[PDB]
Amino acid sequence: MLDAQTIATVKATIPLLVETGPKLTAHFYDRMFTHNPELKEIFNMSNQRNGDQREALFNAIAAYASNIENLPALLPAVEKIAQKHTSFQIKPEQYNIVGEHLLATLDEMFSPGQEVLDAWGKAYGVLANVFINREAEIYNENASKAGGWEGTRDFRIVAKTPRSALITSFELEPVDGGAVAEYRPGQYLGVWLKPEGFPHQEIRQYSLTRKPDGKGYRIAVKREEGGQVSNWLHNHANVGDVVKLVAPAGDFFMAVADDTPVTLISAGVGQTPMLAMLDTLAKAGHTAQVNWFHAAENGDVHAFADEVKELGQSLPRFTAHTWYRQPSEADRAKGQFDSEGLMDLSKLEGAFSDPTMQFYLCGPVGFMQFTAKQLVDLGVKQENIHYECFGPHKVL
Amino acid sequence: MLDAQTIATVKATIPLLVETGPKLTAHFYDRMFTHNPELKEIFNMSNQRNGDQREALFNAIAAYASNIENLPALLPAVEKIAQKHTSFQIKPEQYNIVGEHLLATLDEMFSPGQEVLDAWGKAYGVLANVFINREAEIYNENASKAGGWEGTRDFRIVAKTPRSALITSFELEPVDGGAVAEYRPGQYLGVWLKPEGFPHQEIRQYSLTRKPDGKGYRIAVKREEGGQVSNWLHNHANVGDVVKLVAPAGDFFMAVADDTPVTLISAGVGQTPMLAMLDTLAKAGHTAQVNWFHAAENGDVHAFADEVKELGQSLPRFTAHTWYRQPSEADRAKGQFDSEGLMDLSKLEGAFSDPTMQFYLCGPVGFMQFTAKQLVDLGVKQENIHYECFGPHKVL
Amino acid sequence: MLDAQTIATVKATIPLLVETGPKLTAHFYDRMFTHNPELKEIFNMSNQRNGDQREALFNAIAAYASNIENLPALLPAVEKIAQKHTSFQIKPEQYNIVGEHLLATLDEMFSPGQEVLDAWGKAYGVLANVFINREAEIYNENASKAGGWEGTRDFRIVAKTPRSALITSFELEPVDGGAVAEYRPGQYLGVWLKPEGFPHQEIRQYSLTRKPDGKGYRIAVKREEGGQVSNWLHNHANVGDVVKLVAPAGDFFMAVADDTPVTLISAGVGQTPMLAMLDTLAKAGHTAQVNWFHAAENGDVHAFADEVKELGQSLPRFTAHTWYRQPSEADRAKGQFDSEGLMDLSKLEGAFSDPTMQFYLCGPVGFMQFTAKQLVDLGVKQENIHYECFGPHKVL
Amino acid sequence: MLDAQTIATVKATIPLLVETGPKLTAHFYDRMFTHNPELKEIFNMSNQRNGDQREALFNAIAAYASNIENLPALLPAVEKIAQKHTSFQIKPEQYNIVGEHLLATLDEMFSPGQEVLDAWGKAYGVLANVFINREAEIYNENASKAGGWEGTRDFRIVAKTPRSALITSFELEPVDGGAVAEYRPGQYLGVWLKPEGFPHQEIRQYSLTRKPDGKGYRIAVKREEGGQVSNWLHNHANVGDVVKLVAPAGDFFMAVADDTPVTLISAGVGQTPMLAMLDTLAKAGHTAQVNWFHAAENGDVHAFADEVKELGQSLPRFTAHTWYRQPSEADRAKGQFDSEGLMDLSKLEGAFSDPTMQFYLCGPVGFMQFTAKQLVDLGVKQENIHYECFGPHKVL
Numbered sequence A, B, C, D: 001m002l003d004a005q006t007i008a009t010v011k012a013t014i015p016l017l018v019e020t021g022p023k024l025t026a027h028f029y030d031r032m033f034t035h036n037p038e039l040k041e042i043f044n045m046s047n048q049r050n051g052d053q054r055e056a057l058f059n060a061i062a063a064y065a066s067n068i069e070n071l072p073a074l075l076p077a078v079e080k081i082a083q084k085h086t087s088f089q090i091k092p093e094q095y096n097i098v099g100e101h102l103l104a105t106l107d108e109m110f111s112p113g114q115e116v117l118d119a120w121g122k123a124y125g126v127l128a129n130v131f132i133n134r135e136a137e138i139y140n141e142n143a144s145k146a147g148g149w150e151g152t153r154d155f156r157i158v159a160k161t162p163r164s165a166l167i168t169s170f171e172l173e174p175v176d177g178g179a180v181a182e183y184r185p186g187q188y189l190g191v192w193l194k195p196e197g198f199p200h201q202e203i204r205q206y207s208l209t210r211k212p213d214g215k216g217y218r219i220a221v222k223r224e225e226g227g228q229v230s231n232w233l234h235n236h237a238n239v240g241d242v243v244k245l246v247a248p249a250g251d252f253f254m255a256v257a258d259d260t261p262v263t264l265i266s267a268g269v270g271q272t273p274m275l276a277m278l279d280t281l282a283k284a285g286h287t288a289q290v291n292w293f294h295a296a297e298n299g300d301v302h303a304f305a306d307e308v309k310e311l312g313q314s315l316p317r318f319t320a321h322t323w324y325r326q327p328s329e330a331d332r333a334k335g336q337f338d339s340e341g342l343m344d345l346s347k348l349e350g351a352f353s354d355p356t357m358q359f360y361l362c363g364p365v366g367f368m369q370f371t372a373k374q375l376v377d378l379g380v381k382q383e384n385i386h387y388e389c390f391g392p393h394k395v396l
């Protein structure tokens, strides 16, 4: 329960915080990992990372803690982060650790006196309690469902299938032979790994690709050049190996009625949540129009085109359109794509004059901003457009 | 995004608001129902009501709106109310209505000038947006699940079974013949009714009594003397009739692992969420100890004793104890109960020395406060005790 | 020439700016590209981008403009950005455009009144003049050198060589047959492209890979999956095609004497500036120790190993060590690498006990922070470590 | 990172500083040279000096340090001084020395109390860091270039040529037989000398007179009556002697395209940077008009007229005009000059109606202000006029 002065003391120190931007963050993470190295088992330590997740975390604490009074407007961003933390199994003790390093860094870098450090300790504390409370609800929801569980659960890789030159799907089934939790199409799983070559345990989020069946899950991974986890899954993981999973979480999912037209836009592996959504619509006999717009680099790298076809065939009103950005000669001779180049919806055969249509988007940031702006230029309201990033959360 | 002055203007008017307590509330509801009578189809209009739900709603708006800065601490209460609103299908337009009547009442009763009314309009608005945002997430979650739906759905009563002289269970199956949403044991359904004798549509919350099966639901209702909906369900509703349901919601549910000992305490019809919890544990082969402590007035009114027996028999470590507060002569000659009188856990054979045991409670307020205080007097931590009221939310 | 009040007016609006973080930025870029679409020919419009460059630009303007009094400490960051702008040919007119959109966005989003907007206009103006002045000096330096030029110059691709499965080098020679500017090993070129499939003109920075020779340049590009410019250069560009270049710029370069031991650390294509540095040392007969530590994923993707060998052979004191993170069976049978796994300098044969040794680093952010922290853990002072990012600038 | 009070404390002491003008400066230099005599090896100690360089240095520290907030506007003057310091090899330790003597003088002269001295120490420090940072970049740039070096390098005088009765050129080649750095026409060299008759080491700046060739440099010195270094170079220095040089620096240079008309104005030895510019244009085949306007006292003292002729002959559009201020009888009989008297451009045959023409000027201050004002009176914009002083920097 903060008061005006504490709140003004924190906001008064914000201008001092933004001009030290990167230095500050580095000092904070260098102090964290030195005294609390065990956190290296939760943060990404791959030499291939770019440092965005770290930067976003710290900036959010600074921006959220200083405007804790206006928390109301921050709740949608808090929900998105809380869902993600749940996959990384963030706990209340870790908030204490991050709090000690934040205040110690502020002191070490500025020596602001006790009043300032106390204020920041109170504002951070309130913010940390907001996340701890919501994350406790989600952990509880996940363990209460049928087939749900607390923490990490062991799952055997029961099938490894190459769906293209870059994507391979992995079927997973609990080692305990029991039921697995249900989820909302568009959500993801937390995959914890630490084969013997890993110097640290790595955790990655992979979307669920089909309708829930209470038996197992199916994820599809793209092999990223130099990527630690995707290359291990593609070159070393084998059917028979066991990995640990954290229940399904995520604030991006499809919620429509039977008469709600839906459009699923995606580029490359960003089609994984869309597959779960398409499978769900097909198995439900969705009666309204369903569109599947996808862009792949070429036919070599394009995955799941056969599954998408059989699923749309089962729907009453379904339309699919694929764009190959750089079709090979063989691709042109097979004609397995509709248009070449970027996804130009504006040139499709017929627009979506249905105000009730809902659009889901998932690809790289430039792709989603280019494709979401085409939609509003066509008249689509922003509240009907939904999207998800496979990296830190962005906005357009 | 409020500022210090607006916030101080609202808090400065709070002392003026608490001394007008009941008058104020009456003027607000009298103005609401006069200009917006359609809300009579959502609020309880039964002549048997006591007016607590109205009183709590208004007091919460006054207390929450004036301490909107400290919203963080209010989130657990906001979640409980948001889950309940979801059954009543509260919408954003209705928040506008409640806001117009709140400010109009303040003006009509005090003529505070525009500054005060503007402040209250801004604080209320922020509070209304918090509920609208969380309730929009829940509506989305409910429509995204398999078998889930938006709004109201028609369900046929496929079975009416008398389980005691006061309780009758009703099995319900979608009229559309499709799958129904899953839920977390301990949650409830929103039952919308308006047979031809009702002057208004009434909405009641009934707990789900068994493990989810994706096909239908089973609720158990106690006939309350003079109660509008329970007497219609007991004396007029018939197998074949159709009622409307709103997806399962609720913040009170069981979330345990397989090795988490659980204790289910209940009095009378308060055993309904416990049945869903016991059925869930039994079907999961729960290995840790499971206790079923129940209190009924007598054998005539005691329901589900046979089901509870067969379910516990299927568990490895199960212990049941029943207390009849006023056993009849016939009850004593049948010996279908363990102890007579109030639920005195302190005299049971063996306490719960397991610090990891979780306790769920559900009965009238006096029963739950008497039984929860026995547990902490025995050493049980408060965070291991969970409970739910079948009326406005209370605290002990 | 600002005064205390203007400066305090801008800093007082900073807390309002950080809590609108992403929204604000989006509104600013959406307004820019709508009214000044021609800027799409300068910013990256690839659908493969992640939006970091945009985010960093806007955040820097907010953080720099509000602490313009402390510009002194910002000059090293200003130099790094000014060098980069020079490749994109940023001009004073464009600063006017960015200024109009910044103030219009502030007004549109907050309606702060004229005083606030005037303050921000004055602080931004001072900041824009700092960049315009330094960038004018650099443009002048580039056009004054021998073989130097203003703007863009046409260069023919005279040689296309595949150096590995992912990297291909391109030799470039002026179409005018004249001399080309010299540069400082570690610097880069600005490559402007717009073949016929591009919807917009794209500009990318590629490091110079050899010692300057006043005749032409040689860049080495890694094919990024889905990357617009690298895939065009690898799959469509041909010897004979003409691209436009902007003189060499960059604040990251090697500056050592003949007796200064040097260590060149790099991962993958990050070895491009190191090649220019190694070629320079070899042609100068560097007498002090020169180390070449490189990490590649495997032998298929490892490029320039033969060139590095012949160059080190020409040096008196040279030591090379290569780490393959995921050696293939064929790689192990050829033995063309020293160690497998991550670059663990701590396990090399002998440390760098030379306090005068200078270290240059270039790879992904995680790689450079992991490798730079190993060096200071070994005792290397931070001022002896130098590095460069192929994406926005980071810090560890 | 200064604050309002420190900044106001320094500005409040400025009126006290300007009324002590010369006394103050003398006390500061007398205290410097007493405690830090080694600085006599860097400052000019010739008995022929007039004391302007000292006066300007001290006044700049007072004026810059007190308006450190408005540093932005001072950057062009900071660059000019930083380039010059680089020839004198100024270092960070020396800034500490100048700082100790500045504050000690303030105390000794006024006894202002600690608050004032602390403020001045903080403002000076910020200013000293600005110069140290830029000078570190320049030292790095100079050592990174090909043929570049750190510090001082030995160069043998390989040729001594008398070009007139007052000017003699000296060719210099590294004693190490290696390549020498390139430079921008108009820049200068730092020549360190201390033959055996010198009581102190003297450092002078001499412009480079030809296009860079990576082999050696050629400077042309005017014998100043009583001048220490110019008389040693003219009367005692011999081919074979070795002097020390500091890499080329300077902010005054020519930066034009091939179609940029250029005008080179100069009086006497001020033609040295112009020769480097003319040689550069001639070797590049400059296609636009090139003018060479020069004024010498007479034919005896006029140097390089033959070189300028052969160079202009090699250009397509070249026009030369020479003015002898006091032609001798022999000069008039030879007709080796165009007009007699001062350089009156206004009476030339045809003006420069080309708005894109760039003008470079170099002679004494009166000559440059007289000649630059003629140009703007003719319509030439000020930003197209460039000039350099062979003494402290002035302005007209």
Ligand SMILES: Cc1cc2nc3c(=O)[nH]c(=O)nc-3n(C[C@H](O)[C@H](O)[C@H](O)COP(=O)(O)OP(=O)(O)OC[C@H]3O[C@@H](n4cnc5c(N)ncnc54)[C@H](O)[C@@H]3O)c2cc1C
Pocket (backbone or CB within 6 Å): A044, A046, A047, A048, A049, A050, A188, A204, A205, A206, A207, A208, A219, A220, A221, A222, A223, A224, A225, A226, A227, A228, A229, A230, A231, A269, A272, A273, A364, A388, A389, A390, A391, C048, C049, C050
């Ligand atoms: C909610 C969510 C859902 C996801 N669902 C899936 C899914 O269904 N399938 C799937 O394959 N992945 C999915 N991802 C992404 C995935 O979790 C990881 O990024 C991935 O597995 C990285 O693995 P790693 O082991 O290769 O590499 P790391 O070592 O972390 O490497 C990351 C790699 O990405 C590369 N990269 C390419 N473009 C970018 C870019 N724009 N920014 C940053 N790095 C870039 C790097 O070069 C590097 O190889 C999801 C991510 C999120 C946040």
Ligand SMILES: Cc1cc2nc3c(=O)[nH]c(=O)nc-3n(C[C@H](O)[C@H](O)[C@H](O)COP(=O)(O)OP(=O)(O)OC[C@H]3O[C@@H](n4cnc5c(N)ncnc54)[C@H](O)[C@@H]3O)c2cc1C
Pocket (backbone or CB within 6 Å): B044, B046, B047, B048, B049, B050, B188, B204, B205, B206, B207, B208, B219, B220, B221, B222, B223, B224, B225, B226, B227, B228, B229, B230, B231, B269, B272, B273, B364, B388, B389, B390, B391
């Ligand atoms: C989360 C939740 C879950 C519930 N689950 C169930 C369930 O599984 N089964 C079930 O039978 N009911 C359950 N209820 C209660 C139920 O929703 C209603 O109170 C009930 O159906 C009232 O119905 P009505 O039609 O009889 O009467 P109304 O006309 O609203 O009458 C309410 C009646 O309750 C009587 N009453 C008795 N004690 C009290 C008291 N202490 N305070 C107020 N009124 C009292 C009144 O005398 C009156 O007859 C739940 C309520 C909540 C909030």
Ligand SMILES: Cc1cc2nc3c(=O)[nH]c(=O)nc-3n(C[C@H](O)[C@H](O)[C@H](O)COP(=O)(O)OP(=O)(O)OC[C@H]3O[C@@H](n4cnc5c(N)ncnc54)[C@H](O)[C@@H]3O)c2cc1C
Pocket (backbone or CB within 6 Å): A048, A049, A050, C044, C046, C047, C048, C049, C050, C188, C204, C205, C206, C207, C208, C219, C220, C221, C222, C223, C224, C225, C226, C227, C228, C229, C230, C231, C269, C272, C273, C364, C388, C389, C390, C391
């Ligand atoms: C100073 C400087 C010097 C450079 N020198 C070279 C050089 O010598 N050689 C060279 O090959 N490149 C160099 N680069 C990088 C290069 O300029 C570009 O990033 C590149 O050409 C991108 O080209 P594009 O056409 O493929 O793709 P865009 O469409 O812009 O695609 C960028 C791509 O990078 C991928 N990516 C992988 N990892 C990441 C990550 N961590 N963050 C963001 N995107 C990621 C994306 O998946 C995507 O394919 C340099 C960059 C800088 C700033």
Ligand SMILES: Cc1cc2nc3c(=O)[nH]c(=O)nc-3n(C[C@H](O)[C@H](O)[C@H](O)COP(=O)(O)OP(=O)(O)OC[C@H]3O[C@@H](n4cnc5c(N)ncnc54)[C@H](O)[C@@H]3O)c2cc1C
Pocket (backbone or CB within 6 Å): D044, D046, D047, D048, D049, D050, D188, D204, D205, D206, D207, D208, D219, D220, D221, D222, D223, D224, D225, D226, D227, D228, D229, D230, D231, D269, D272, D273, D364, D388, D389, D390, D391
């Ligand atoms: C950027 C720059 C570039 C230069 N390039 C050249 C060049 O290419 N060629 C060249 O010959 N010199 C050049 N000079 C000038 C030169 O560096 C020195 O002033 C010179 O060598 C002085 O040398 P010194 O040994 O004679 O005398 P000092 O003992 O320092 O004597 C200076 C002398 O100048 C005389 N003098 C004449 N007019 C003035 C005046 N108006 N103000 C002050 N003293 C005056 C004095 O009478 C005295 O003899 C340059 C100076 C600068 C700052």
Ligand code: HEM
Pocket (backbone or CB within 6 Å): A039, A042, A043, A044, A053, A054, A056, A057, A058, A060, A061, A064, A080, A081, A084, A085, A088, A090, A091, A094, A095, A096, A098, A127, A128, A131, A391, A392, A393
């Ligand atoms: C109140 C404080 C916190 C806030 C405001 C916060 C905010 C964030 C944000 C903004 C992100 C990026 C979200 C995105 O991907 O969309 C993030 C990621 C993450 N957070 Fe939190 N966070 C906080 C506390 C914590 C704590 C205590 C830990 C525990 C050690 C933690 C660990 C993580 C991890 C591991 C990631 C993923 C980054 C990775 O992949 O390397 N966070 N957080």
Ligand code: HEM
Pocket (backbone or CB within 6 Å): B039, B042, B043, B044, B053, B054, B056, B057, B058, B060, B061, B064, B080, B081, B084, B085, B088, B090, B091, B094, B095, B096, B098, B127, B128, B131, B391, B392, B393
């Ligand atoms: C921001 C404002 C609101 C707050 C703080 C609020 C608070 C509450 C509270 C405290 C309760 C009792 C919860 C309990 O049973 O545990 C409640 C019940 C209820 N609320 Fe809300 N409420 C708000 C707005 C609304 C709106 C706009 C409507 C729509 C007309 C509404 C309709 C109801 C109904 C119907 C009930 C059940 C009462 C009954 O059964 O008669 N509420 N609310």
Ligand code: HEM
Pocket (backbone or CB within 6 Å): C039, C042, C043, C044, C053, C054, C056, C057, C058, C060, C061, C064, C080, C081, C084, C085, C088, C090, C091, C094, C095, C096, C098, C127, C128, C131, C391, C392, C393
């Ligand atoms: C005073 C204002 C400005 C500041 C503080 C600023 C700052 C920055 C920063 C921090 C970056 C990232 C640097 C990194 O890669 O290390 C950047 C990139 C860039 N800036 Fe500036 N900038 C400013 C004005 C401008 C203007 C007027 C334009 C012209 C339209 C511009 C165009 C760019 C471009 C094109 C990039 C590269 C991003 C890309 O690749 O898409 N900047 N700037």
Ligand code: HEM
Pocket (backbone or CB within 6 Å): D039, D042, D043, D044, D053, D054, D056, D057, D058, D060, D061, D064, D080, D081, D084, D085, D088, D090, D091, D094, D095, D096, D098, D127, D128, D131, D391, D392, D393
């Ligand atoms: C932050 C402080 C400084 C400022 C503002 C400054 C300013 C100046 C100025 C205005 C000039 C004349 C430039 C002209 O010829 O156009 C100059 C010359 C010079 N400065 Fe600096 N200076 C500073 C610190 C230093 C230091 C620490 C030294 C080292 C002992 C130094 C040594 C010199 C020398 C040797 C000259 C040439 C004078 C001569 O030929 O005798 N300066 N400086």
Ligand SMILES: [Cl-]
Pocket (backbone or CB within 6 Å): A044, A049, A050, A051, A052, A053, A054
């Ligand atoms: Cl990261």
Ligand SMILES: [Cl-]
Pocket (backbone or CB within 6 Å): B044, B049, B050, B051, B052, B053, B054
């Ligand atoms: Cl009521």
Ligand SMILES: [Cl-]
Pocket (backbone or CB within 6 Å): C044, C049, C050, C051, C052, C053, C054
């Ligand atoms: Cl970007």
Ligand SMILES: [Cl-]
Pocket (backbone or CB within 6 Å): D044, D049, D050, D051, D052, D053, D054
């Ligand atoms: Cl002097």
Ligand code: NA
Pocket (backbone or CB within 6 Å): A040, A041, A042, A043, A044, A045, A046, A200, A201, A202, A203
């Ligand atoms: Na890790």
Ligand code: NA
Pocket (backbone or CB within 6 Å): A267, A268, A269, A271, A295, A296, A301, A302, A303
């Ligand atoms: Na694909």
Ligand code: NA
Pocket (backbone or CB within 6 Å): B040, B041, B042, B043, B044, B045, B046, B200, B201, B202, B203
């Ligand atoms: Na009603």
Ligand code: NA
Pocket (backbone or CB within 6 Å): B267, B268, B269, B271, B295, B296, B301, B302, B303
């Ligand atoms: Na009962």
